Symmetry: C2
Subunit: 230 residues, 2 copies
């Protein structure tokens, strides 16, 4: 199809919670080789987030069951083989995304926020790979994850306002990397807390408590506006 | 794989919410041609319920969008084509299940409980077909659905107590068929109230107690909702 049609199909697939269709359409869009609009970027991101997240969840479930079954050898071997099938799917998905990032998305990014978004995405998908990697391969994927996050981080601190959602989402996912992949809870907390504090400080007339109060009331205003116009 | 390995795989896939895998495993078990245990019967039913339910949900969403599209012809045609793609998938799934029931499950049932469960499933999947059927297939699929439920009914009323969970679940799904497919609130409420009351008039174990009480609550909730209109 053409780009307009592929994007329409992705939106329909998203509504239908058919994330494989959504991912396929946005992959085709990307492979047409032009820089993605913000909307197209978000559709691609959401599609592959759901596709990969299903496998991450299934893998956690099967690993948990497999660790808590030390009574039967046959069932344990079955759980191992099923876990490995899910790991293979997860790796195919991650490699798909990383190829898209390396061949189209990162090289074609013109603005700094696009660059940060796609380098964060590379950090994310290398983190997903590292969750199921073993041996030296693990060391590699972990390292690559950190590197991508770090590159994104350096651009975001130089070129992006602390309140920009892409900078904040990067800080969120990088702190998660430190907590869950490097088992470094104090560094994770410091990254998340410094990013939060920088966003708070950029808001000229608010502190943390006043920010919380104000965002709650803003939500209530939006909710009332929704209710009253129906 | 052999039966025990396929069943273990189906249970693992259920835990992992990988229902395509679960359905493929239980389909292979069924095609081995041995009568299913109660557990295997429930695994098969749950797997295909989830597999077909995902498509029913997607179909509802895309049909809603397609008829809400005011003035964009390209988008409306794309929504139509996407709905038809989903319809084809749903029809493939239902035909798969109906073939399992016709070739293996129904003719191999040597207990009336199993036969009633499988004939109820036959009614269920012909109902799902009927929700998307076009032209002459509509009349056929609805008719097939009703006959299947009715055959299940004729066996159950003769062979099982009103409290039995399979008889109750048949009444639940058959009353839903009357309400939603035949738009017949009177026959739906009649069937559901009769099943509920005959149960109240009374013979179980713990698991069957649980199943029956849940189905009873579903019957009574349906009754309330339906008698509200």
């Amino acid at each position: 199809m053409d780009k307009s049609e592929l994007v329409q199909k992705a939106k329909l697939a998203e509504q239908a919670e058919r994330y494989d269709d959504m991912a396929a359409a946005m992959k085709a869009v990307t492979e047409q080789g032009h820089e993605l609009s913000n909307e197209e970027r978000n559709l691609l991101s959401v599609a592959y987030k759901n596709v990969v997240g299903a496998r991450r969840s299934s893998w956690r479930v099967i690993s948990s069951i497999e660790q808590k079954t030390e009574r039967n050898e046959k069932k344990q071997q079955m759980g191992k083989e099923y876990r490995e099938k899910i790991e293979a799917e997860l790796q195919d998905i991650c490699n798909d995304v990383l190829e898209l990032l390396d061949k189209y998305l990162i090289p074609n990014a013109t603005q700094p926020e696009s660059k940060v978004f796609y380098l964060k995405m590379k950090g994310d998908y290398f983190r997903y790979l590292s969750e199921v990697a073993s041996g030296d391969n693990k060391q590699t994927t972990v390292s690559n994850s950190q590197q991508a996050y770090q590159e994104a981080f350096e651009i975001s601190k130089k070129e992006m306002q602390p309140t920009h959602p892409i900078r904040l989402g990067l800080a969120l996912n990088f702190s998660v990397f430190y907590y869950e992949i490097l088992n470094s809870p104090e560094k994770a907390c410091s990254l998340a807390k410094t990013a939060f504090d920088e966003a708070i400080a950029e808001l000229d007339t608010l502190n943390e408590e006043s920010y919380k109060d104000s965002t709650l009331i803003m939500q209530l205003l939006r909710d009332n506006l929704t209710l009253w116009t129906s």
